[PDB]
From a paper:
Replication Protein A (RPA) is a heterotrimeric single stranded DNA-binding protein with essential roles in DNA replication, recombination and repair. In Archaea, the same function is also fulfilled by a heterotrimeric RPA. We report three crystal structures and five cryo-EM structures of Pyrococcus abyssi RPA (hereafter referred to PabRPA), in its apo form as well as bound to ssDNA. We find that archaeal and eukaryotic RPAs share a conserved heterotrimerization core, which is composed of three OB domains connected through a three-helix bundle formed by a C-terminal α-helix from each subunit.
To gain insights into the contacts between AROD and OB-1, the crystal structure of the Rpa1 N-terminal domains AROD-OB-1 was determined at 1.8 Å resolution. The high-resolution view of the AROD-OB-1 interface shows that all three helices of AROD contribute to the interaction with OB-1. The chemical nature of the interactions at the interface is diverse and includes networks of direct and water-mediated buried polar contacts, as well as contacts between hydrophobic residues. To test the effect of the disruption of this interaction on the DNA-binding properties of OB-1, we compared the binding of wild-type AROD-OB-1 and a triple mutant (K17A-E23A-E27A) to a surface-immobilized poly-dT35 ssDNA by BLI. Strikingly, the AROD-OB-1 triple mutant shows a 10-fold higher affinity for ssDNA than the wild-type construct (KD = 72.0 ± 17.0 nM vs 847 ± 216 nM). Consistently, the structure reveals that AROD binds next to the DNA-binding site of OB-1, with its solvent-exposed glutamic acid residues pointing toward the DNA-binding cleft.
Residue numbers in the entry:
A (entry chain B): 2 to 59, 61 to 180
B (entry chain A): 3 to 180
Amino acid sequence: TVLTKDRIIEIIERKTGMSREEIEEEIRKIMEEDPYLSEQGAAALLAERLGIDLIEKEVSLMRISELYPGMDPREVNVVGRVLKKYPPREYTRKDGSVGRVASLIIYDDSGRARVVLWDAKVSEYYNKIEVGDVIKVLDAQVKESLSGLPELHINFRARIILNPDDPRVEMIPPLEEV
Amino acid sequence: VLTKDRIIEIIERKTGMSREEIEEEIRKIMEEDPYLSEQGAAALLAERLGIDLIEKEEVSLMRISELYPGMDPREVNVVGRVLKKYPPREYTRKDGSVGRVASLIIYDDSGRARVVLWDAKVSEYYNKIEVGDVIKVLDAQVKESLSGLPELHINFRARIILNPDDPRVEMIPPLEEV
Ligand SMILES: [Cl-]
């Protein structure tokens, strides 16, 4: 990841509640264990051990209401709280094989979107996501759902960050308000 | 042991699906397997959704201030908001093997407690928990901390419910007030 050591420490403080002094002591222990790590690399390893998923390169003000079918997946960068999780199901490929697909409904301060997890993304994320959790979606293909809602398609080329550190998260209404 | 109606209520809470949507999923499972009862089909749906059904999730008025070392783990039923999460660590067992252990600090309207996740409980819950989340702790052993205060030990017997449906939750102060 290209995130600086200070940015990683800021994310760790927000996600763990540890003081800066406690976090620095954890980084020192990691560096004492591995002399090849830089301070940034040690901070990234600490984030990983804490179950914090860091994006390789970080920002966007984009809202769900701004998504449109066929937009460049490189422009897709939205956050949303999970409102609904539907059961995973099987689908048949043109080659005759069977894959997996699972759908969720997420929302931000602007609207809702269906999020479609494909194949390994179901095994990778489906049980990790809970209703009320916030996800950040990157590099997803956008399709028009039969409903009208934008559809974010999460395949092996897309990225999901569970409970991201992002300024848009605080503007998403809580579940009770929806 | 949980009734079909109780399983549907848990599925509604954990997925946000409507009762009508859940019933339709149970119908599909029953149409696939004629040997399942309605309760068995609801339990299979919960399992496919990644929901672990806790057979004893009773209500209690118990507070963290009422915990004492050596109290009956069957009486242990407390809720708390997560204030701090420390990194998972390795520890050495009496047999020479290496296990994992991770600690959190939680608090309710009455006080704070260290929560210690042992071995598979770290893999099972640690990444699912975040600061500000509320957890319900059941069947944990209570030990005296190095400062003479009660700590909750989450071993094989213990259970944790993430963001529980419990009347005590609304009484826990938000992070900003602490
Ligand atoms: Cl919420």
